[PDB]
Amino acid sequence: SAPESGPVMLLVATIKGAWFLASDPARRTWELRGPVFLGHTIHHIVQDPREPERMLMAARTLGPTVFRSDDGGGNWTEATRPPAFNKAPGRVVDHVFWLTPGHASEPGTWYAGTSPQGLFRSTDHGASWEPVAGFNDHPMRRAWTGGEPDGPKMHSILVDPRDPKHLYIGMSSGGVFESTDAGTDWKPLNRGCAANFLPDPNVEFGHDPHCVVQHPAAPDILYQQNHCGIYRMDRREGVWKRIGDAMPREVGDIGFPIVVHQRDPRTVWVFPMDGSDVWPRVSPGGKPAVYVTRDAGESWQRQDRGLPTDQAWLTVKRQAMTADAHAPVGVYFGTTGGEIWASADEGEHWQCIASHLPHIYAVQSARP
Ligand SMILES: [Cl-]
Ligand SMILES: [Cl-]
Ligand SMILES: [Cl-]
Ligand SMILES: [Cl-]
């Protein structure tokens, strides 16, 4: 990986529309465009890295759908067939929560994760979606998911860069699950991860991962921010290890998002929150900070330069942190209070580049 260069774009999904932030090549001044779809609840906006001119946006009302653009966001068209569960001999899609573009060798293929938990696939750039039957009708599904916050959801859909058949998914609640046959079969992969909200924490599934990532440079390495900690797994070992235990006692290792440095599998960023109350309640602290590790979780450093020093009760949701692929890597986050904070030096300094936006669900980097 050669570092990317030039302008960065941030795709910002909020409860009342989509906004877009564009930088100069130096990433010092930013331009805000939007709202796009003002009054609609936008859950996720993702650029196809295979074809940068293509973008998908998970949105509600039309009911729940996916809008597509083939001109880098200049025009949006609703799905001809959005994600919908099959007729029961039944469950209903509340919203499309997460969008993942497929493997390099399968252009036009995407996965979608819904609330309640459901996995869907498009092979036509998100125009039409069908259920991934191997998950949605798996005999263990109801046991893995359970029943009905905003509702339970499917997230962290990961397609292995080395193999389109190797997939990972995250479910709140349920856990991390793996397929080695493009989703025709799934198995739980939660070993080593706590589930302290369950009667027996040492079960196979039922866990509450918040955000899972597979490193693009070292795809055996997975990181997750869970309701019960920050974990790292080397897939060859098959166990999640709580690297979050290196966090300071007063800060803890609870939070929602997790982000990895594009080139360095040892560098990861989290946004800690107070998880000391009963499940699923996570509360903000008054002293906001991102924490970085540059040694795969052995040590953590606080990153708060430029951020409000105190009486600042910031919530950062799962999809609301992202990072670019520039040198140095820039890091960004969006708060439920409507601020977009940006760093162009791996989280060492922060600058508020947007404020007074509606409640932010997701922030995603993109190449204009
Ligand atoms: Cl449906
Ligand atoms: Cl279905
Ligand atoms: Cl815990
Ligand atoms: Cl709001």
TrEMBL record:
Gene3D superfamilies: YVTN repeat-like/Quinoprotein amine dehydrogenase. It comes from the Bacteria. This is Glycosyl hydrolase, BNR repeat protein. Keywords: Hydrolase. It comes from Cupriavidus pinatubonensis (strain JMP 134 / LMG 1197) (Cupriavidus necator (strain JMP 134)). PANTHER family: EXO-ALPHA-SIALIDASE (PTHR43739:SF5), XYLOGLUCANASE (EUROFUNG) (PTHR43739). One of its GO terms (molecular function) is hydrolase activity. SUPFAM superfamilies: Oligoxyloglucan reducing end-specific cellobiohydrolase (SSF110296). The keyword Hydrolase applies. GO terms for biological process: xyloglucan metabolic process.
